[PDB]
């Protein structure tokens, strides 16, 4: 049974609610983004209307085989009427195709559902500038002050400089980057660009990247592993055993691996600057964990909410424990007393 924080009151709508069977009264199912915790339940046998971005709809059709007649892509930044209710999709600054949804309810209430997002000051100049929001359904993944991490631009600067130095010292080094979902593509695309290489990957991963509307993608990626000196591997293989096993398969072309594991936040963020990050090393294999986040830091979240001034907040992450719920409610009240709304 579908929980309350996935229902939009006064509508026939749900958000990210595909794992509960037929939801009573639902006339349109919204999907914010193509991550498995959110699409859990969709397949080729789904027969209700799904509303989403263009990119999400390319993934539903090619990767999950949802039939074309049930996929309803909407443009961004554009007022659309769905089943008699005005909606807008906004870029969530999460993974490719990810959106926030603004719902203009028939009674005059306005609701923003963030989906998953990484808040940014540029959102203060979207269509959100124009009017008041009564209810915010908020991605609270990192809602605690300990959750700090650098900008995505600083992280990419570190990865490009680390890879270019290593391969210039040793032209026979291979670079490997872990992946287990869409998102974070700038890590492997930026490193391959500085090295003058295409990115090599499986047929399954190539298919996924081909759904993402990335400009000039045919110039950037390939299934011919032998031609490429940046390879993608599943995240589970990014360890000393998996990497050893991969280097054997390369026919003595390489004698060293440098590997990256993009994570979210880890507790080594509480002590170390991005500049000071060091790898784990065994023999001719080195592994860097880099804190590339596609969710808001505490401070980015707080700035967004203090600017929006919602009348009510409903968290969508960390909702399963009393202690998490209590902690998040305290910070929402601090933010409101500090800013005066
Ligand atoms: Ni996500």
From Swiss-Prot:
Tissue: Expressed in brain, heart, kidney, liver, pancreas, placenta and skeletal muscle.
Record note on quaternary structure: Binds constitutively to TP53BP1. Binds CDC27, which is itself a component of the anaphase promoting complex (APC). Binds PIAS1.
Lineage: Eukaryota, Metazoa, Chordata, Craniata, Vertebrata
Record's function text: May be required for DNA interstrand cross-link repair. Also required for checkpoint mediated cell cycle arrest in early prophase in response to mitotic spindle poisons. Possesses beta-lactamase activity, catalyzing the hydrolysis of penicillin G and nitrocefin. Exhibits no activity towards other beta-lactam antibiotic classes including cephalosporins (cefotaxime) and carbapenems (imipenem).
Induction remark: During mitosis. The mRNA encoding this protein contains an internal ribosome entry site (IRES) in its 5'-UTR. This 5'-UTR generally suppresses translation while specifically promoting expression during mitosis, when cap-dependent translation may be impaired.
Annotated transmembrane regions: none
Encoding gene, per UniProt annotation: DCLRE1A
Localization per record: Nucleus
Family: Belongs to the DNA repair metallo-beta-lactamase (DRMBL) family.
Name used for this protein in its record: DNA cross-link repair 1A protein
Coverage span on the entire protein: 700 to 1040 of 1040
